[PDB]
Amino acid sequence: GPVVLSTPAQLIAPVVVAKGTLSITTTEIYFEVDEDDSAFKKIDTKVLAYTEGLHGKWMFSEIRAVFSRRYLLQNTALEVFMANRTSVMFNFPDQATVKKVVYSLPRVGVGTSYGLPQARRISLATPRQLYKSSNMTQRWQRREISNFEYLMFLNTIAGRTYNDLNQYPVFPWVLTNYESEELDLTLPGNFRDLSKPIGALNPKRAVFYAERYETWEDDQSPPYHYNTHYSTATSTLSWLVRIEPFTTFFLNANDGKFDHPDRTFSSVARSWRTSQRDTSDVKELIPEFYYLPEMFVNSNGYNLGVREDEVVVNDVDLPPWAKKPEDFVRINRMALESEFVSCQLHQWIDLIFGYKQRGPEAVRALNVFHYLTYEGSVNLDSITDPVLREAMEAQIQNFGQTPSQLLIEPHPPR
Amino acid sequence: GPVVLSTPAQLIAPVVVAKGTLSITTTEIYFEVDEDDSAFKKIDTKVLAYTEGLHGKWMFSEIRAVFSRRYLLQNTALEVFMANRTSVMFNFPDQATVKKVVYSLPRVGVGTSYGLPQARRISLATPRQLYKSSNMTQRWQRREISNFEYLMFLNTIAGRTYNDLNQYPVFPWVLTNYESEELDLTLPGNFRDLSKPIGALNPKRAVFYAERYETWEDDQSPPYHYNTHYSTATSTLSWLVRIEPFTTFFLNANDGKFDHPDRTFSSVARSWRTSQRDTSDVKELIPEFYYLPEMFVNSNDVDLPPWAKKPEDFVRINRMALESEFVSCQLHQWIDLIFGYKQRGPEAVRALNVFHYLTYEGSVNLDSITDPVLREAMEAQIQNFGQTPSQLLIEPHPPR
């Protein structure tokens, strides 16, 4: 019907980004891909099958929340959340268009669970603002909210999302013991020091980072401890290799065949080693590690004959105290909600969204990353030469994007 | 360590059936053939070598799928799938034993790929129930699963298995042109009518069968259109004559050496023709035709189509066809013939899809056959006429 608004847009989905044309009527949102687009043609159909929205229609009545989102460090994207708990994300040309879209959409605000007013102002508000005006921190302390729910709140507000592997949500490793036969959730030694970054846990390697920070000499390259992030598409694809369409996506992006078993996520205990040994590995976990068994198993069908030489990915090997996936996730989420984590989580938050994210305290905390990572870092619009901008966007996706800082004061303990 | 359950059973291998004892402990499944058995001692050594399970051990921790199976039409077998994609099949004395074996193995159900619950009940569930309760059809319609994958799915819950060639998986011929210099996957004529059996493809030969049906006259064996089956242990061996056990077994089958060059798989084009004019060849294809290049060499070879240079090519083009949009919009029809409502009954009659009655589930109860020699005699009859996959649905299969 009445097309109240129309604008070029970009569908931001788990494994697909496609240029299309958003159109907003008086009751729905429509999106059609540019099936003629060169880049879009080279997209595997299998992948397109898992991608919703390419020709979607969203009922205004179904809208429940509208979040301001940044695509590749640029505050020009939006993410709408549907009543059926699903969500869609489009990236527009300018923050200016976003505003038009936000004002031409229902006044769902940012939802209602966070305790923020249902106003278009909120949808556009900033991360630090949203945090400030929310009651979640209290409820979290008051135990009305679980550690998992709280960490999801922070990540959502910080702009993290399941629709962009470059800004996936971020969760901390909670346990350090993945060797033992049993796991005693009351024995401190089994828990990770939630006050230190991954790169600071092992003093042996920690030295390499402090040393490298000290003996720094360069131009336009502020000193940094890690050239590797704790959250990136690459990382995310590795953790979700056993799930479509990530699997296929990776494969297509890998000459059609998997990667050497010793490099692909194969062992939960082995990953933790690498995250303590490797100088380039400072990875942090993902939400799933606390609720999605699938992620740890080969869900392929049967009688599909492949083990001839054809590389194949089998079940992730769990720690002895974890018989089957359902077990690992159960126990892990239990540890995440344990009392130990509860009384330290604020410190980890400080490193990720807190006052130790960037600055004097960030350097004293051994928590400094490549400057091109932090918010504000770059302005793709400034780059005028396409081949130049692209190369830049390519780098952002390679280094990763630090979550938006939510507070510049020490986060309150639970 | 301690044996929780022990019972007589038969290993059902790619081309071997050996009696032995199956011991279920508390953490593993064991199987030791009875080497003192006569039949066993008669089996060729080369064949035994390429046969695994005669002295096997399987870890519970490795179990992933436990499907109920049928052997020679009798619902008394079982097939276990391992985490490394391996599988082993056993045949027991009766369903009651199968049930015990199931309640003694890990609760893995039928796996977690077809959307079914991981409950021992599924492992005993009926083929029709598995179909109904699965979620593979929708995923298929959604294109999240390929035609190959869906077909393989249907076969698996239908009871088909790479472990018993008499019930080998069933895949349809997709292309009909194997002699043109090039194959346009956009020219309808280059394809096969999936709503029709292989026998009803040739207009002329078709009428022949219809006549045979109407003008039956016997009343000692209900009417049937074909006396050949689309899937047989022999056809399978034939397609895979250049690889063994198969090769070696075949040589033992033909009592000595190979088969007559003219009546042997030597060219896909020729074989296809044979399956169009020859009144006794309504063969259908097998998975291999869509992924196993090695199948078309010798280590003379199979004469590949013009558009098919090397073996690797025939497989890719053919696989592309199986996945082409032409196949997609009409593939459901084929399913209606093989596992659908047109598999049997009046509907199968119009379809020109009726096979020997001794080929359908429920056709015969080997247990009632008291005379030992008559039983063995009956079984061989079954291995010759082929076994029709179980019926999955009785309604029309929705299109993709």
UniProtKB/Swiss-Prot annotation, chain A:
Predominant in many brain structures. Also expressed at medium levels in spleen, thymus, prostate, testis and ovary. Low level expression is seen in heart, kidney, pancreas, skeletal muscle and intestine. Signal peptide: none annotated. It is found in: Cytoplasm; Membrane. Residues 125-414 form the BEACH domain. Residues 1-106 form the BEACH-type PH domain. Binds to type II regulatory subunits of protein kinase A and anchors/targets them to the membrane. May anchor the kinase to cytoskeletal and/or organelle-associated proteins. Belongs to the WD repeat neurobeachin family. It is linked to Neurodevelopmental disorder with or without early-onset generalized epilepsy: An autosomal dominant neurodevelopmental disorder characterized by global developmental delay, variably impaired intellectual development, speech delay, and behavioral abnormalities including autism or autistic features, attention deficits and hyperactivity, or aggressive behavior. About half of patients develop early-onset generalized epilepsy with different seizure types. The disease is apparent from infancy or early childhood. RII-alpha binding site, predicted to form an amphipathic helix, could participate in protein-protein interactions with a complementary surface on the R-subunit dimer. Interacts with RII subunit of PKA. This is Neurobeachin. The lineage of its organism: Eukaryota, Metazoa, Chordata, Craniata, Vertebrata. The gene is NBEA. The chain holds residues 2150 to 2563 of 2946 of the full protein.
